[PDB]
From a paper:
AARSs play an essential role in protein synthesis by charging tRNAs with their cognate amino acids. Similar to other LeuRSs, the C. muris LeuRS contains a predicted editing domain exhibiting highly conserved motifs that are important for the hydrolysis of tRNALeu mischarged with noncognate amino acids, such as isoleucine or norvaline, while excluding cognate Leu-tRNALeu. The structures show the typical seven-β-strand and three-α-helix fold of the LeuRS connective polypeptide domain (CP1), plus archaeon/eukaryote-specific insertions, denoted I1ae, I2ae, I3ae, and I4ae.
Calorimetric titrations yielded dissociation constants (Kds) of 213 and 215 μM for Nva2AA and Ile2AA, respectively, over the range of affinities observed for bacterial LeuRS, but they were lower than those seen for other editing tRNA synthetases, such as class II threonine-tRNA synthetase (ThrRS). These data, together with the conservation of important active-site residues, suggest that CmLeuRS preserves posttransfer editing activity. In our structures, a water molecule is well positioned for promoting hydrolysis (3 to 4 Å to the carbon alpha atom) and is coordinated by a eukaryote-specific lysine (K496). This suggests a common editing mechanism via nucleophilic attack of this water on the oxygen carbonyl, consistent with quantum mechanical calculations on LeuRS. Compared to the structure of the CmLeuRS-AN6426-AMP complex, the posttransfer analogues retain 3 to 4 extra water molecules (depending on the monomer chain) and a phosphate (CmLeuRS-Ile2AA complex), which mediate polar interactions between the compounds and protein residues.
Numbering used by the authors:
A (entry chain A), B (entry chain A): 254 to 315, 330 to 541
The structure:
Amino acid sequence: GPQEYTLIKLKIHLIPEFLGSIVKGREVFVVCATLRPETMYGQTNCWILPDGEYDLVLAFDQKIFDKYEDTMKECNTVYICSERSAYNMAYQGIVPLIHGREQGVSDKLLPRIVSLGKVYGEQLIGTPLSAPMTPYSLIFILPMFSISMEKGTGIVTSVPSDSPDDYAALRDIKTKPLLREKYSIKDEWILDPLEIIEVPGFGFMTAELLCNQYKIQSQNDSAKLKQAKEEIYKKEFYEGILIRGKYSGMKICDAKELIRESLIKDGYALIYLE
Amino acid sequence: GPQEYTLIKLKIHLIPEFLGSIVKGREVFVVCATLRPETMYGQTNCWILPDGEYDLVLAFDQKIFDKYEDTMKECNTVYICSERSAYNMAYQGIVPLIHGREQGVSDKLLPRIVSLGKVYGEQLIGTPLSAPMTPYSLIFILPMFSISMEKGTGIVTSVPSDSPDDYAALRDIKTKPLLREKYSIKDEWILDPLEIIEVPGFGFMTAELLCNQYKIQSQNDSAKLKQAKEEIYKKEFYEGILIRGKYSGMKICDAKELIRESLIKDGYALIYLE
Ligand SMILES: CC[C@H](C)[C@H](N)C(=O)N[C@@H]1[C@H](O)[C@@H](CO)O[C@H]1n1cnc2c(N)ncnc21
Ligand SMILES: CC[C@H](C)[C@H](N)C(=O)N[C@@H]1[C@H](O)[C@@H](CO)O[C@H]1n1cnc2c(N)ncnc21
C-alpha cells in the first residue's frame, strides 16, 4: 500500500568545492519527503543521517534517453537523495532514465538513473539552504540519528515547533556539546523554533509540550516518539489553526492541500509516491 | 536494477457475462509483458496461469483522483493483470490512482488503484482476443504452468516459432488429451505456429530446433529452457532476419525499436518498467 508524500526542494545556496567538481555548474537541491507541507513556515534546519550514503542524481529542470551525453546537456539540476528514492522518482517522471551501458550488451534495454556520484550525510553538515515559506533566509543541514535510509529520500526538513522528532533531535544538539564538537556544528546553524500553528488546548509550541507529556528525553525514544508523532499528526490536522501564510487563520484541514498545490505550482515541491 | 518491457494490449473480442457484469460496457484488454515486440507477427495464442489471481484494473483510454466516481466516469478501459504490475503501471501513469477511503481517515492521502474485481486465469481459458500484427484474426487464452505471478503482468503472449517456452507449453497441450480435457480446451483454440524469423544457420522455426538441441520434453525443464531462452534471445537479436511486416528483410537489431515505436504509436503497446 503506497503513501503519498510531498517532496520539498531545498536549494543549496553555496555549493562546496567537493560537490562543485562533480556537478559542474548545475543547481543542486537536497530533497526531503514530508507528509506535512503546511508546516514549511516553521523550518529551522534540515536533517541528514551522518553515515547515510546519498546519490547526486541528475534531475529534470522545473521517455528514456539513449545517451548519457544528451541527458547531461539537457538537465541542469541535481537532487541529493537516496538511490532508492531516485528510482521511485524516475518511475514517476521526476528524474531522467537512460538506457544503461554498464552491463550486458545492446540486445536488452536497461533503464538506469544518472547518478554523478555519492556523498555521505556527514560531509553535508553545515550546508546553507534556501527553503520555501520559512522566514529564515538560510537554514542549515544538521545530523539526525533516527533517520531511516529506507524511507523517503533519507533527508528530512526540520519543524521543531510541530514535530516531536525534530524537537528532540534539535534539543539533543543544543544540550550536548560533545555532539556539536564531534560534527563541528557552529552556533549560527542552530536556529530558533517558530510559532506556526495553534492547537486550541495546547498553544503554539505543541511538539515541545508533547515531548514533556510523553517524558521523551532523547531523539532515540522510539516508542514514545511514535505515540507523540501520531497524536500531534491527528490533532493538528483536525484542530490546528495556521498563524502564518496565505491561509493564516484557517484550519489545517481546509488549507493543507491549497498550500501543497502552491508549493508545487511554484516549483518548491513535487508529488512523490512510495 | 529495473528492466524495460513492452506491454502488449490484447483486446477481448467477446466479453463473457461473468466479466461484463463487473466492467459494465468498458473495453477490456489482457495485457502482457514482453522483451520481444518484434515477434508479434507470430502470436498463436495467449498464456495465463490457471491458478493465478488477476485484477480487473481501471485504465486510461488511449495527478491522483479524489473520487472513485469521477475515475469510473472518465475511464472506459479495463486491463486484466496482476495487482503487482497494476501498481507499477499506476506509478508510471498507465492506470489512474485514487485517494482511497478503505482505511484510516481524511488526514492522510493513500493512493490506490481502482480494481473492479478479481479473476482466476482458469476462468479466462478460451477467451478470444484481437492481437496486434499476427495474421490470425483471433487468438485464444490457454494455460501455461511455468508462468511466474511475480514477473510482468503474469500474462504472456505466445510465439512458439521463436520462444522455447511457448513451443514446449503448446506442445504439452497438443500431446496431452488429459490436459485438454481438464480445462476443456477446444481444438479450434490451438493455432499453428507461424514462420516469422530466419536465423541463417537454423532456418525459420528456431524454437523447435533448439528444444530438440537441448532435449527439452516439457514446459517444466527449467534449467534447459533457461539455456535455450538465452541462446535464442541473443542469436535472434544479432543474426535473425524478419520475414514479415514493414521491416521484412531487415535484421532484428535494426528493426526492433522501429516495430516497438509503431506498436506504441498505434495504441497496441506501452513502455513498462519493473
Ligand atoms: C512537521 C513535520 C516535519 C516537517 C517533519 N520533520 C517531517 O517532514 N517528517 C517526515 C514525514 O512527514 C514523517 C511521516 O512520514 O516522517 C518524516 N520522514 C520523512 N522521511 C524520513 C526518513 N527517511 N527517516 C525518518 N523520518 C522521515
Ligand atoms: C518471442 C517471445 C515471446 C512473445 C514470449 N512468449 C514472451 O513474451 N516472453 C516474455 C519475456 O520476453 C520473457 C523475458 O522477460 O519472459 C516472458 N514473460 C513475461 N512475463 C512472464 C511471466 N509472468 N512468467 C513467465 N514468463 C514471462
